[PDB]
Amino acid sequence: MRKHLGGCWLAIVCVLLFSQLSSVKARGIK
Numbered sequence: 001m002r003k004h005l006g007g008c009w010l011a012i013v014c015v016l017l018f019s020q021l022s023s024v025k026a027r028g029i030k
Contacts, residue, residue: 022028 019029
């Protein structure tokens with residue numbers, strides 16, 4: 001039964017979604 005939601009779960013998505021955005025011009029992804 002699905003483990004994804006709208007909550008503290010977004011804290012896993014958020015950091016990925018800026019890391020990837022950053023890593024082209026900068027370090028970003030870590």
